[PDB]
Amino acid sequence: MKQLEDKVEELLSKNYHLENEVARLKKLLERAEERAELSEGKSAELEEELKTVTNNLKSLEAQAEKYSQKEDKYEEEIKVLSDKLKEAETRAEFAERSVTKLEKSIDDLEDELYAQKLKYKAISEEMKQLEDKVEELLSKNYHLENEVARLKKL
Amino acid sequence: RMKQLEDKVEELLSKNYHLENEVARLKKLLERAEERAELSEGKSAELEEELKTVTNNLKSLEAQAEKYSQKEDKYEEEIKVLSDKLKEAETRAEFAERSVTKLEKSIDDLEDELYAQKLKYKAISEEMKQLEDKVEELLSKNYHLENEVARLKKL
């Protein structure tokens, strides 16, 4: 019967070790599940962080599109302004070239007029002298005619 | 005391059986939990790299926005200068074009006054030729009267 007593002892032994292996495994499993849970929690948070940044990216892309359209407007308005400016400068430039030619034409006409006035004064003076000459000659003629008449009666 | 021993060996083998099954149950669950953790860790690693990429794209856009702004002010600046120049240029054009009109009028006023003066001159000139003719006539008439006076004094 020493057999039974030895087998009892042998089983008590093995069970002892098996109970320890179970306790060790339960503990290891418990932690392992905690590790997986915390890790899955981290992935979840990262996913939320990525949604947040992706949304911000979208907001900035939308702002860039607005900037892009306003930038085109500015380019257009600058062109339209440039086109009117060139046109205004050109018109001014043309007229100012005309103003110079006209001012010179006036200066010459004003000189021509002044000289014409001098021409008139000069001829008016000669006319004065000629009238006086005709007047003296008519007086002479009158007196000569009367002297001939007087003589003719003698 | 042998029946008692046999039942003990029976119960010990029973607990042993149940224990081996628990060890096998737990080892399988442990493996699965480890693999689950490994998978999730791999996923977190991937998400972190994706997060890094998107965050960088964001910073790049922020940089581009600041450049859009500074350029916006640049545009406003040029539009102001151009608007002022256009205004000064139109004033200049209008004044010059109106000056052309006034000067052309002055020219008409000078040309007509000049025409008139030359008319007045031509006239006095003609009257002068008449008087000059008169002088000739009187000189000849006086000459012959003088001859007659002398002729009469010598009769």
UniProtKB/Swiss-Prot annotation, chain A:
The gene is TPM1. Signal peptide: none annotated. It is found in: Cytoplasm, Cytoskeleton. The modification Phosphoserine is found at S39, S59, S105, S124. The molecule is in a coiled coil structure that is formed by 2 polypeptide chains. The sequence exhibits a prominent seven-residues periodicity. Homodimer. Heterodimer of an alpha (TPM1, TPM3 or TPM4) and a beta (TPM2) chain. Interacts with HRG (via the HRR domain); the interaction contributes to the antiangiogenic properties of the histidine/proline-rich region (HRR) of HRG. Interacts (via N-terminus) with LMOD2 (via N-terminus) and TMOD1 (via N-terminus). Binds to actin filaments in muscle and non-muscle cells. Plays a central role, in association with the troponin complex, in the calcium dependent regulation of vertebrate striated muscle contraction. Smooth muscle contraction is regulated by interaction with caldesmon. In non-muscle cells is implicated in stabilizing cytoskeleton actin filaments. This is Tropomyosin alpha-1 chain. The chain holds residues 176 to 273 of 284 of the full protein. The lineage of its organism: Eukaryota, Metazoa, Chordata, Craniata, Vertebrata. The modification Phosphotyrosine is found at Y114. Belongs to the tropomyosin family. Transmembrane segments: none annotated.
